[PDB]
Amino acid sequence: TVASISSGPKHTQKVPILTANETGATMPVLPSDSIETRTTYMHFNGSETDVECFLGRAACVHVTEIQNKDATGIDNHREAKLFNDWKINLSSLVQLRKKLELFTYVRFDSEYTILATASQPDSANYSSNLVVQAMYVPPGAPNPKEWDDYTWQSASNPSVFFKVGDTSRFSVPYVGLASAYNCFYDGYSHDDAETQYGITVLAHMGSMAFRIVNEHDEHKTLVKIRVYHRAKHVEAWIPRAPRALPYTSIGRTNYPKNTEPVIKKRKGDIKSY
C-alpha cells in the first residue's frame, strides 16, 4: 500500500485544495495535492484501532465489599455487608464509560472476571479460606434477604462459587432487550409528567449479588470484590463528540455546576507558539 505517491510541480485550473466546508463534507485532501512528494508505503494496517480491539480489554467496572462475621443479632444482613449486591450497570466507573460513549448504540457479549481479596484489619490468628458465591439476580426474581436465604439455592439462576484470592470468569451473551444497548436515550418510560429521563429507565438489567459461603470464625474478615468487564464481538453505531466535562451520575449526561474551563488558555497571544 502506498502512503504517498510521487507528485511533481502543478500549474493547473484544477485546484483540489479550495473547497466549501459549508457542505458538511471533509474532502479527502493529501500531501501530494499541495507539495511535491516521493513514494512511501504504509507498512501498517490499523489493526489496533478496530473497535473490537478498542473495547476488547478488561476494565474495572465495580468494586464492592462484603464481610464474614457472626450474623447473630444482625437485623439487616444487607446493611451489615453480610452480603451485598450490585445493581448492574457499566456506567458507574468512568474510564470505560468515556470509551463506550464515543458511540450511541453498542452491541457485544461480556466476559466478566471477578477478583476477590481478603483483608483482616484487626488482630486475627490467621487468614481463613473463604469461598465467595456471586449470583446473578435478574429483574423479577426473589431478591435475597439474609446471607443464607432460600434464594441462594439458585436453582434456576446462574451462580459461580470461587475462593477469595482467586478469580472467577465466565461470559454472558448480549442480554439487551433491543438490537443494541442505548448509550444514550432522549426519552422516558412513558409519557408521565414526573417520570425519570434517561437510560436509567432503560437499562435496568437487574443486579448481581455476592456473599461468603463460610460461617464465621472468631475474627472478622473483609472481602473486597472487583468486577472487570471485557466486550467481545463488538458492534458500534453512530459516533458522537467525546465527553468533555466530568460525570455526576450513572445514566444522565449531567455535568457539575461551576465546573472549570476545559479548554487550556494560552500563556500568551493567539500569535504565540
Partner: protein, 59 residues
C-alpha cells in the same frame, strides 16, 4: 411488570346486552382462559418469586 416494557389493557363491555328467557333469573357467568400463541418466545431463565422456604423440609 415494567413500565417502558408494558403491554396494554384488556376490557370487555356489553355490545347490546344479555337477555334471559322467561322463567329464568339472576347472574350468568363467563369462564375465561389464557394460553400463548405459537408466536411466543421466553428467554433468560431465572428463579420464580412464586415459591420460597425458611427451613429445609424433612421426611
Amino acid at each position: 411488570p415494567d413500565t417502558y416494557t408494558s403491554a396494554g389493557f384488556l376490557s370487555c363491555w356489553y355490545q347490546t346486552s344479555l337477555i334471559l328467557p322467561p322463567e329464568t333469573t339472576g347472574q350468568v357467568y363467563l369462564l375465561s382462559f389464557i394460553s400463548a400463541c405459537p408466536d411466543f418466545k421466553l428467554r433468560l431463565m431465572k428463579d420464580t418469586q412464586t415459591i420460597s422456604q425458611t427451613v429445609a423440609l424433612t421426611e
